[PDB]
Amino acid sequence: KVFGRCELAAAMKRHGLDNYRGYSLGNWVCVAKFESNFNTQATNRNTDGSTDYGILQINSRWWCNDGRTPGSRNLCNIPCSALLSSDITASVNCAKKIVSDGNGMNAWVAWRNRCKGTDVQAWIRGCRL
Ligand SMILES: [Cl-]
Ligand SMILES: [Cl-]
Ligand SMILES: [Cl-]
Ligand SMILES: [Cl-]
Ligand SMILES: [Cl-]
Ligand code: NA
């Protein structure tokens, strides 16, 4: 599923991401845009052999099981395939664990490089929420 900008903002808000660990909603929409272009089916392989999955590009090196990342962990205790669903629940719940891991949203390189320090409220501008 490819979400619209405001449809994703609304879904993230309903799943409790607005100001989760202090990160306003625009931060989450911004990171999703750059990670996946709002596409729940996005996948990308990392240089180490792990793979990032879904709208928030969550890495099988630590967070999910895909059966093909040796030495990896499954800290969200989910198959990586669950992060590709049209329903974002699994991605949001895992993202809540990631963002609490000590580094905040710096856990997503793309947030640090493309969202941090910018006007992230623009990502939810005009949305009826
Ligand atoms: Cl957009
Ligand atoms: Cl915001
Ligand atoms: Cl594995
Ligand atoms: Cl959803
Ligand atoms: Cl923080
Ligand atoms: Na894993």
mmCIF file of N, CA and C and ligand atoms in Angstrom:
data_model
loop_
_atom_site.group_PDB
_atom_site.id
_atom_site.type_symbol
_atom_site.label_atom_id
_atom_site.label_comp_id
_atom_site.label_asym_id
_atom_site.label_seq_id
_atom_site.Cartn_x
_atom_site.Cartn_y
_atom_site.Cartn_z
ATOM 1 N N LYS A 1 0.837 -1.194 0.000
ATOM 2 C CA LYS A 1 0.000 0.000 0.000
ATOM 3 C C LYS A 1 0.867 1.237 0.000
ATOM 4 N N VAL A 2 0.554 2.210 -0.847
ATOM 5 C CA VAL A 2 1.247 3.491 -0.822
ATOM 6 C C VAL A 2 0.309 4.495 -0.171
ATOM 7 N N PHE A 3 0.658 4.935 1.034
ATOM 8 C CA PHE A 3 -0.166 5.890 1.761
ATOM 9 C C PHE A 3 -0.033 7.284 1.167
ATOM 10 N N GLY A 4 -1.126 8.041 1.244
ATOM 11 C CA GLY A 4 -1.022 9.477 1.145
ATOM 12 C C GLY A 4 -0.437 10.079 2.409
ATOM 13 N N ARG A 5 0.101 11.288 2.245
ATOM 14 C CA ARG A 5 0.762 11.995 3.336
ATOM 15 C C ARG A 5 -0.146 12.150 4.555
ATOM 16 N N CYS A 6 -1.337 12.711 4.357
ATOM 17 C CA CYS A 6 -2.224 12.925 5.494
ATOM 18 C C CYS A 6 -2.879 11.638 5.975
ATOM 19 N N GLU A 7 -3.133 10.687 5.070
ATOM 20 C CA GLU A 7 -3.650 9.395 5.503
ATOM 21 C C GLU A 7 -2.653 8.701 6.428
ATOM 22 N N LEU A 8 -1.357 8.801 6.117
ATOM 23 C CA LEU A 8 -0.337 8.222 6.992
ATOM 24 C C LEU A 8 -0.219 8.988 8.303
ATOM 25 N N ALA A 9 -0.250 10.315 8.248
ATOM 26 C CA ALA A 9 -0.214 11.081 9.487
ATOM 27 C C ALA A 9 -1.348 10.666 10.410
ATOM 28 N N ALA A 10 -2.557 10.515 9.857
ATOM 29 C CA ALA A 10 -3.702 10.124 10.672
ATOM 30 C C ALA A 10 -3.522 8.724 11.247
ATOM 31 N N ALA A 11 -3.023 7.782 10.442
ATOM 32 C CA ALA A 11 -2.818 6.427 10.936
ATOM 33 C C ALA A 11 -1.742 6.385 12.006
ATOM 34 N N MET A 12 -0.665 7.157 11.822
ATOM 35 C CA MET A 12 0.371 7.181 12.850
ATOM 36 C C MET A 12 -0.160 7.791 14.141
ATOM 37 N N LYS A 13 -0.976 8.839 14.033
ATOM 38 C CA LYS A 13 -1.548 9.457 15.225
ATOM 39 C C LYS A 13 -2.458 8.487 15.962
ATOM 40 N N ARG A 14 -3.279 7.742 15.223
ATOM 41 C CA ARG A 14 -4.183 6.796 15.865
ATOM 42 C C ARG A 14 -3.417 5.690 16.578
ATOM 43 N N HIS A 15 -2.248 5.322 16.065
ATOM 44 C CA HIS A 15 -1.411 4.297 16.668
ATOM 45 C C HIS A 15 -0.471 4.843 17.738
ATOM 46 N N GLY A 16 -0.623 6.111 18.123
ATOM 47 C CA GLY A 16 0.083 6.663 19.263
ATOM 48 C C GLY A 16 1.469 7.217 19.006
ATOM 49 N N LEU A 17 1.800 7.582 17.768
ATOM 50 C CA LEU A 17 3.146 8.074 17.490
ATOM 51 C C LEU A 17 3.316 9.574 17.691
ATOM 52 N N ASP A 18 2.231 10.339 17.759
ATOM 53 C CA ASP A 18 2.356 11.782 17.935
ATOM 54 C C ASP A 18 2.945 12.068 19.305
ATOM 55 N N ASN A 19 4.148 12.646 19.296
ATOM 56 C CA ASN A 19 4.898 13.016 20.494
ATOM 57 C C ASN A 19 5.340 11.820 21.322
ATOM 58 N N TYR A 20 5.360 10.596 20.588
ATOM 59 C CA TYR A 20 5.949 9.451 21.265
ATOM 60 C C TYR A 20 7.419 9.637 21.507
ATOM 61 N N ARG A 21 7.858 9.636 22.866
ATOM 62 C CA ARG A 21 9.220 9.930 23.299
ATOM 63 C C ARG A 21 9.648 11.326 22.844
ATOM 64 N N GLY A 22 8.663 12.204 22.700
ATOM 65 C CA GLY A 22 8.895 13.606 22.430
ATOM 66 C C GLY A 22 8.970 13.960 20.967
ATOM 67 N N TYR A 23 8.724 13.006 20.078
ATOM 68 C CA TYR A 23 8.883 13.231 18.646
ATOM 69 C C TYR A 23 7.515 13.534 18.053
ATOM 70 N N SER A 24 7.313 14.791 17.651
ATOM 71 C CA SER A 24 6.046 15.193 17.067
ATOM 72 C C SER A 24 5.779 14.443 15.766
ATOM 73 N N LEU A 25 4.504 14.450 15.380
ATOM 74 C CA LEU A 25 4.034 13.625 14.274
ATOM 75 C C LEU A 25 4.802 13.875 12.976
ATOM 76 N N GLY A 26 5.162 15.123 12.686
ATOM 77 C CA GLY A 26 5.840 15.389 11.426
ATOM 78 C C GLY A 26 7.159 14.654 11.294
ATOM 79 N N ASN A 27 7.833 14.403 12.423
ATOM 80 C CA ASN A 27 9.071 13.644 12.384
ATOM 81 C C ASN A 27 8.837 12.267 11.807
ATOM 82 N N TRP A 28 7.726 11.636 12.188
ATOM 83 C CA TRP A 28 7.471 10.263 11.758
ATOM 84 C C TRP A 28 7.059 10.205 10.303
ATOM 85 N N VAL A 29 6.292 11.198 9.847
ATOM 86 C CA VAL A 29 5.895 11.242 8.445
ATOM 87 C C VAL A 29 7.108 11.525 7.574
ATOM 88 N N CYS A 30 7.947 12.477 8.004
ATOM 89 C CA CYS A 30 9.183 12.800 7.289
ATOM 90 C C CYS A 30 10.063 11.562 7.116
ATOM 91 N N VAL A 31 10.287 10.809 8.193
ATOM 92 C CA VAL A 31 11.167 9.655 8.068
ATOM 93 C C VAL A 31 10.557 8.609 7.148
ATOM 94 N N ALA A 32 9.235 8.430 7.206
ATOM 95 C CA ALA A 32 8.589 7.450 6.333
ATOM 96 C C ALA A 32 8.715 7.851 4.868
ATOM 97 N N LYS A 33 8.588 9.150 4.577
ATOM 98 C CA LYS A 33 8.751 9.601 3.200
ATOM 99 C C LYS A 33 10.114 9.194 2.663
ATOM 100 N N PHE A 34 11.163 9.460 3.434
ATOM 101 C CA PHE A 34 12.505 9.241 2.918
ATOM 102 C C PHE A 34 12.916 7.781 2.976
ATOM 103 N N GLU A 35 12.369 7.022 3.918
ATOM 104 C CA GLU A 35 12.707 5.606 4.002
ATOM 105 C C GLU A 35 12.023 4.789 2.914
ATOM 106 N N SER A 36 10.749 5.093 2.616
ATOM 107 C CA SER A 36 9.940 4.180 1.825
ATOM 108 C C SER A 36 9.067 4.860 0.787
ATOM 109 N N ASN A 37 9.073 6.186 0.705
ATOM 110 C CA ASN A 37 8.100 6.910 -0.124
ATOM 111 C C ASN A 37 6.667 6.534 0.241
ATOM 112 N N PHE A 38 6.439 6.202 1.515
ATOM 113 C CA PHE A 38 5.123 5.859 2.066
ATOM 114 C C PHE A 38 4.612 4.507 1.585
ATOM 115 N N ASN A 39 5.486 3.655 1.079
ATOM 116 C CA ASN A 39 5.117 2.364 0.495
ATOM 117 C C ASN A 39 5.359 1.272 1.538
ATOM 118 N N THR A 40 4.279 0.635 2.001
ATOM 119 C CA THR A 40 4.421 -0.412 3.012
ATOM 120 C C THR A 40 5.231 -1.608 2.534
ATOM 121 N N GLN A 41 5.377 -1.809 1.227
ATOM 122 C CA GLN A 41 6.058 -2.992 0.708
ATOM 123 C C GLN A 41 7.533 -2.751 0.411
ATOM 124 N N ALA A 42 8.068 -1.589 0.774
ATOM 125 C CA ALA A 42 9.470 -1.310 0.492
ATOM 126 C C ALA A 42 10.398 -2.271 1.230
ATOM 127 N N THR A 43 11.399 -2.762 0.514
ATOM 128 C CA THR A 43 12.475 -3.567 1.079
ATOM 129 C C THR A 43 13.787 -3.088 0.486
ATOM 130 N N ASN A 44 14.856 -3.185 1.273
ATOM 131 C CA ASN A 44 16.172 -2.811 0.776
ATOM 132 C C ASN A 44 17.216 -3.620 1.526
ATOM 133 N N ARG A 45 18.187 -4.144 0.790
ATOM 134 C CA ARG A 45 19.221 -4.979 1.377
ATOM 135 C C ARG A 45 20.409 -4.131 1.804
ATOM 136 N N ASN A 46 20.928 -4.421 2.998
ATOM 137 C CA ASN A 46 22.076 -3.711 3.549
ATOM 138 C C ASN A 46 23.384 -4.405 3.178
ATOM 139 N N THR A 47 24.484 -3.650 3.289
ATOM 140 C CA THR A 47 25.786 -4.196 2.911
ATOM 141 C C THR A 47 26.150 -5.424 3.737
ATOM 142 N N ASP A 48 25.688 -5.494 4.986
ATOM 143 C CA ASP A 48 26.013 -6.625 5.850
ATOM 144 C C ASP A 48 25.174 -7.873 5.573
ATOM 145 N N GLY A 49 24.196 -7.809 4.664
ATOM 146 C CA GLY A 49 23.323 -8.932 4.397
ATOM 147 C C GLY A 49 21.970 -8.856 5.075
ATOM 148 N N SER A 50 21.801 -7.962 6.047
ATOM 149 C CA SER A 50 20.486 -7.716 6.603
ATOM 150 C C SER A 50 19.628 -6.956 5.596
ATOM 151 N N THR A 51 18.350 -6.838 5.916
ATOM 152 C CA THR A 51 17.375 -6.190 5.048
ATOM 153 C C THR A 51 16.493 -5.269 5.882
ATOM 154 N N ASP A 52 16.166 -4.100 5.328
ATOM 155 C CA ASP A 52 15.196 -3.187 5.916
ATOM 156 C C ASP A 52 13.827 -3.405 5.301
ATOM 157 N N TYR A 53 12.800 -3.331 6.139
ATOM 158 C CA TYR A 53 11.445 -3.710 5.742
ATOM 159 C C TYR A 53 10.402 -2.640 6.065
ATOM 160 N N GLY A 54 9.551 -2.345 5.090
ATOM 161 C CA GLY A 54 8.337 -1.605 5.333
ATOM 162 C C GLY A 54 8.514 -0.101 5.322
ATOM 163 N N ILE A 55 7.451 0.543 5.795
ATOM 164 C CA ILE A 55 7.304 1.980 5.646
ATOM 165 C C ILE A 55 8.346 2.728 6.475
ATOM 166 N N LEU A 56 8.843 2.114 7.543
ATOM 167 C CA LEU A 56 9.891 2.709 8.351
ATOM 168 C C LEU A 56 11.227 1.985 8.211
ATOM 169 N N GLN A 57 11.348 1.066 7.252
ATOM 170 C CA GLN A 57 12.622 0.446 6.893
ATOM 171 C C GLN A 57 13.371 -0.109 8.112
ATOM 172 N N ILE A 58 12.673 -0.981 8.813
ATOM 173 C CA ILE A 58 13.178 -1.578 10.046
ATOM 174 C C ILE A 58 14.086 -2.747 9.704
ATOM 175 N N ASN A 59 15.261 -2.792 10.348
ATOM 176 C CA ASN A 59 16.379 -3.650 9.953
ATOM 177 C C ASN A 59 16.282 -5.017 10.621
ATOM 178 N N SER A 60 16.413 -6.072 9.822
ATOM 179 C CA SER A 60 16.487 -7.438 10.321
ATOM 180 C C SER A 60 17.755 -7.742 11.106
ATOM 181 N N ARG A 61 18.750 -6.855 11.104
ATOM 182 C CA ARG A 61 19.938 -7.102 11.913
ATOM 183 C C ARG A 61 19.594 -7.139 13.396
ATOM 184 N N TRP A 62 18.596 -6.356 13.818
ATOM 185 C CA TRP A 62 18.242 -6.287 15.227
ATOM 186 C C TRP A 62 16.777 -6.575 15.540
ATOM 187 N N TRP A 63 15.863 -6.176 14.655
ATOM 188 C CA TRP A 63 14.490 -5.967 15.089
ATOM 189 C C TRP A 63 13.482 -7.014 14.672
ATOM 190 N N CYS A 64 13.741 -7.775 13.621
ATOM 191 C CA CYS A 64 12.758 -8.725 13.120
ATOM 192 C C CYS A 64 13.479 -9.943 12.569
ATOM 193 N N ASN A 65 12.735 -11.039 12.427
ATOM 194 C CA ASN A 65 13.298 -12.269 11.885
ATOM 195 C C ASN A 65 12.899 -12.458 10.434
ATOM 196 N N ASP A 66 13.894 -12.647 9.572
ATOM 197 C CA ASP A 66 13.642 -13.017 8.185
ATOM 198 C C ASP A 66 14.272 -14.337 7.774
ATOM 199 N N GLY A 67 14.908 -15.051 8.699
ATOM 200 C CA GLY A 67 15.474 -16.352 8.411
ATOM 201 C C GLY A 67 16.752 -16.335 7.609
ATOM 202 N N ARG A 68 17.255 -15.156 7.226
ATOM 203 C CA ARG A 68 18.403 -15.088 6.333
ATOM 204 C C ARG A 68 19.372 -13.979 6.735
ATOM 205 N N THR A 69 19.420 -13.636 8.021
ATOM 206 C CA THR A 69 20.390 -12.689 8.560
ATOM 207 C C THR A 69 21.142 -13.361 9.709
ATOM 208 N N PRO A 70 22.178 -14.146 9.413
ATOM 209 C CA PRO A 70 22.874 -14.888 10.476
ATOM 210 C C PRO A 70 23.469 -13.972 11.542
ATOM 211 N N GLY A 71 23.374 -14.415 12.797
ATOM 212 C CA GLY A 71 23.853 -13.668 13.939
ATOM 213 C C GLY A 71 22.923 -12.571 14.386
ATOM 214 N N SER A 72 21.812 -12.378 13.694
ATOM 215 C CA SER A 72 20.970 -11.237 13.970
ATOM 216 C C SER A 72 20.058 -11.503 15.159
ATOM 217 N N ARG A 73 19.461 -10.430 15.647
ATOM 218 C CA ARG A 73 18.464 -10.533 16.691
ATOM 219 C C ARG A 73 17.083 -10.247 16.112
ATOM 220 N N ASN A 74 16.074 -10.505 16.945
ATOM 221 C CA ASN A 74 14.673 -10.311 16.607
ATOM 222 C C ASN A 74 14.008 -9.596 17.781
ATOM 223 N N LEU A 75 14.460 -8.365 18.045
ATOM 224 C CA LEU A 75 14.090 -7.691 19.288
ATOM 225 C C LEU A 75 12.628 -7.269 19.330
ATOM 226 N N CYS A 76 11.983 -7.064 18.182
ATOM 227 C CA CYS A 76 10.546 -6.814 18.180
ATOM 228 C C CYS A 76 9.732 -8.103 18.166
ATOM 229 N N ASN A 77 10.397 -9.254 18.074
ATOM 230 C CA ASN A 77 9.765 -10.572 18.118
ATOM 231 C C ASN A 77 8.658 -10.707 17.069
ATOM 232 N N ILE A 78 9.014 -10.435 15.821
ATOM 233 C CA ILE A 78 8.063 -10.495 14.714
ATOM 234 C C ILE A 78 8.782 -10.971 13.461
ATOM 235 N N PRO A 79 8.099 -11.658 12.552
ATOM 236 C CA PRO A 79 8.691 -11.881 11.231
ATOM 237 C C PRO A 79 8.762 -10.567 10.488
ATOM 238 N N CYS A 80 9.845 -10.400 9.732
ATOM 239 C CA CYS A 80 9.989 -9.180 8.964
ATOM 240 C C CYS A 80 8.834 -9.003 7.985
ATOM 241 N N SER A 81 8.240 -10.104 7.511
ATOM 242 C CA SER A 81 7.135 -10.008 6.552
ATOM 243 C C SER A 81 5.946 -9.256 7.134
ATOM 244 N N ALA A 82 5.792 -9.269 8.459
ATOM 245 C CA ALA A 82 4.711 -8.522 9.095
ATOM 246 C C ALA A 82 4.894 -7.020 8.962
ATOM 247 N N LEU A 83 6.115 -6.559 8.706
ATOM 248 C CA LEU A 83 6.350 -5.138 8.516
ATOM 249 C C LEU A 83 6.016 -4.669 7.117
ATOM 250 N N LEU A 84 5.500 -5.546 6.263
ATOM 251 C CA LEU A 84 5.139 -5.185 4.902
ATOM 252 C C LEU A 84 3.636 -5.062 4.715
ATOM 253 N N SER A 85 2.863 -5.252 5.776
ATOM 254 C CA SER A 85 1.416 -5.267 5.674
ATOM 255 C C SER A 85 0.873 -3.878 5.345
ATOM 256 N N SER A 86 -0.330 -3.852 4.773
ATOM 257 C CA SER A 86 -0.999 -2.573 4.531
ATOM 258 C C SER A 86 -1.440 -1.906 5.829
ATOM 259 N N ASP A 87 -1.574 -2.678 6.902
ATOM 260 C CA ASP A 87 -1.865 -2.149 8.226
ATOM 261 C C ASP A 87 -0.531 -1.887 8.919
ATOM 262 N N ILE A 88 -0.346 -0.668 9.415
ATOM 263 C CA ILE A 88 0.980 -0.269 9.876
ATOM 264 C C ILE A 88 1.245 -0.654 11.325
ATOM 265 N N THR A 89 0.322 -1.397 11.952
ATOM 266 C CA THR A 89 0.429 -1.638 13.392
ATOM 267 C C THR A 89 1.782 -2.232 13.784
ATOM 268 N N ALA A 90 2.224 -3.281 13.085
ATOM 269 C CA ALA A 90 3.474 -3.935 13.470
ATOM 270 C C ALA A 90 4.659 -2.989 13.335
ATOM 271 N N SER A 91 4.705 -2.222 12.241
ATOM 272 C CA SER A 91 5.793 -1.263 12.070
ATOM 273 C C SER A 91 5.789 -0.207 13.168
ATOM 274 N N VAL A 92 4.610 0.296 13.535
ATOM 275 C CA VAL A 92 4.530 1.330 14.570
ATOM 276 C C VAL A 92 4.984 0.784 15.920
ATOM 277 N N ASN A 93 4.506 -0.404 16.287
ATOM 278 C CA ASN A 93 4.877 -0.960 17.583
ATOM 279 C C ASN A 93 6.370 -1.248 17.664
ATOM 280 N N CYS A 94 6.954 -1.746 16.576
ATOM 281 C CA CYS A 94 8.399 -1.942 16.558
ATOM 282 C C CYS A 94 9.125 -0.603 16.597
ATOM 283 N N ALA A 95 8.632 0.384 15.850
ATOM 284 C CA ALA A 95 9.265 1.697 15.873
ATOM 285 C C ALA A 95 9.269 2.274 17.282
ATOM 286 N N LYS A 96 8.217 2.010 18.054
ATOM 287 C CA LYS A 96 8.187 2.484 19.435
ATOM 288 C C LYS A 96 9.322 1.891 20.265
ATOM 289 N N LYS A 97 9.660 0.628 20.025
ATOM 290 C CA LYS A 97 10.793 0.020 20.719
ATOM 291 C C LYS A 97 12.121 0.602 20.234
ATOM 292 N N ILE A 98 12.271 0.760 18.919
ATOM 293 C CA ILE A 98 13.502 1.304 18.357
ATOM 294 C C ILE A 98 13.787 2.691 18.913
ATOM 295 N N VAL A 99 12.792 3.571 18.866
ATOM 296 C CA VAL A 99 13.014 4.955 19.282
ATOM 297 C C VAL A 99 13.301 5.063 20.770
ATOM 298 N N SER A 100 13.022 4.017 21.535
ATOM 299 C CA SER A 100 13.287 4.011 22.961
ATOM 300 C C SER A 100 14.620 3.375 23.301
ATOM 301 N N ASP A 101 15.413 2.991 22.297
ATOM 302 C CA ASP A 101 16.624 2.193 22.507
ATOM 303 C C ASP A 101 17.819 3.006 22.984
ATOM 304 N N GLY A 102 17.670 4.319 23.150
ATOM 305 C CA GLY A 102 18.720 5.181 23.657
ATOM 306 C C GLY A 102 19.088 6.302 22.708
ATOM 307 N N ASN A 103 18.931 6.080 21.405
ATOM 308 C CA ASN A 103 19.355 7.067 20.422
ATOM 309 C C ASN A 103 18.204 7.869 19.836
ATOM 310 N N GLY A 104 16.996 7.716 20.370
ATOM 311 C CA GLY A 104 15.856 8.419 19.813
ATOM 312 C C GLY A 104 15.706 8.162 18.337
ATOM 313 N N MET A 105 15.297 9.201 17.613
ATOM 314 C CA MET A 105 15.099 8.988 16.184
ATOM 315 C C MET A 105 16.385 8.955 15.379
ATOM 316 N N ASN A 106 17.543 9.181 16.005
ATOM 317 C CA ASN A 106 18.812 8.962 15.325
ATOM 318 C C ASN A 106 19.014 7.511 14.930
ATOM 319 N N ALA A 107 18.211 6.597 15.463
ATOM 320 C CA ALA A 107 18.282 5.216 15.013
ATOM 321 C C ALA A 107 18.019 5.101 13.519
ATOM 322 N N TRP A 108 17.251 6.025 12.952
ATOM 323 C CA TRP A 108 17.041 6.098 11.507
ATOM 324 C C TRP A 108 18.023 7.131 10.991
ATOM 325 N N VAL A 109 19.068 6.649 10.316
ATOM 326 C CA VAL A 109 20.047 7.521 9.675
ATOM 327 C C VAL A 109 19.342 8.605 8.863
ATOM 328 N N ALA A 110 18.355 8.208 8.059
ATOM 329 C CA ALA A 110 17.650 9.175 7.213
ATOM 330 C C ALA A 110 16.947 10.263 8.030
ATOM 331 N N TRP A 111 16.457 9.957 9.240
ATOM 332 C CA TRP A 111 15.895 11.036 10.059
ATOM 333 C C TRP A 111 16.980 12.027 10.455
ATOM 334 N N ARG A 112 18.141 11.523 10.873
ATOM 335 C CA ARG A 112 19.206 12.437 11.261
ATOM 336 C C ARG A 112 19.652 13.283 10.077
ATOM 337 N N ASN A 113 19.713 12.689 8.883
ATOM 338 C CA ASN A 113 20.274 13.392 7.744
ATOM 339 C C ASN A 113 19.270 14.232 6.981
ATOM 340 N N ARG A 114 17.969 13.948 7.116
ATOM 341 C CA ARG A 114 16.982 14.614 6.270
ATOM 342 C C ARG A 114 15.830 15.261 6.999
ATOM 343 N N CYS A 115 15.590 14.926 8.249
ATOM 344 C CA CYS A 115 14.480 15.475 9.004
ATOM 345 C C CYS A 115 14.938 16.294 10.187
ATOM 346 N N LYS A 116 15.955 15.819 10.908
ATOM 347 C CA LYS A 116 16.410 16.484 12.113
ATOM 348 C C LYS A 116 16.798 17.918 11.789
ATOM 349 N N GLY A 117 16.264 18.861 12.559
ATOM 350 C CA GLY A 117 16.620 20.246 12.393
ATOM 351 C C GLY A 117 15.904 20.964 11.278
ATOM 352 N N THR A 118 14.961 20.316 10.618
ATOM 353 C CA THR A 118 14.141 20.928 9.586
ATOM 354 C C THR A 118 12.748 21.189 10.147
ATOM 355 N N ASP A 119 11.912 21.848 9.343
ATOM 356 C CA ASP A 119 10.543 22.167 9.754
ATOM 357 C C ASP A 119 9.647 20.953 9.491
ATOM 358 N N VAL A 120 9.634 20.017 10.449
ATOM 359 C CA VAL A 120 8.932 18.761 10.206
ATOM 360 C C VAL A 120 7.416 18.925 10.243
ATOM 361 N N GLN A 121 6.920 19.987 10.878
ATOM 362 C CA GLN A 121 5.486 20.261 10.881
ATOM 363 C C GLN A 121 4.936 20.408 9.465
ATOM 364 N N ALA A 122 5.781 20.788 8.501
ATOM 365 C CA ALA A 122 5.302 20.912 7.129
ATOM 366 C C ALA A 122 4.743 19.589 6.616
ATOM 367 N N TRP A 123 5.238 18.468 7.143
ATOM 368 C CA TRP A 123 4.776 17.168 6.680
ATOM 369 C C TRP A 123 3.342 16.863 7.076
ATOM 370 N N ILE A 124 2.798 17.554 8.073
ATOM 371 C CA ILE A 124 1.403 17.369 8.465
ATOM 372 C C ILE A 124 0.558 18.606 8.187
ATOM 373 N N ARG A 125 1.126 19.616 7.527
ATOM 374 C CA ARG A 125 0.395 20.842 7.223
ATOM 375 C C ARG A 125 -0.845 20.543 6.399
ATOM 376 N N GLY A 126 -1.969 21.150 6.787
ATOM 377 C CA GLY A 126 -3.221 20.959 6.086
ATOM 378 C C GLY A 126 -3.974 19.689 6.419
ATOM 379 N N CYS A 127 -3.348 18.731 7.094
ATOM 380 C CA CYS A 127 -4.018 17.471 7.372
ATOM 381 C C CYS A 127 -5.084 17.648 8.445
ATOM 382 N N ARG A 128 -6.255 17.072 8.209
ATOM 383 C CA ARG A 128 -7.326 17.080 9.194
ATOM 384 C C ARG A 128 -7.101 15.894 10.127
ATOM 385 N N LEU A 129 -6.645 16.172 11.345
ATOM 386 C CA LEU A 129 -6.350 15.116 12.311
ATOM 387 C C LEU A 129 -7.067 15.346 13.639
HETATM 388 CL CL CL B 1 4.167 13.611 -0.015
HETATM 389 CL CL CL B 2 5.048 17.974 13.688
HETATM 390 CL CL CL B 3 18.064 -14.887 10.687
HETATM 391 CL CL CL B 4 -3.037 1.376 9.210
HETATM 392 CL CL CL B 5 15.374 11.591 22.403
HETATM 393 NA NA NA B 6 16.922 -10.734 12.671
#
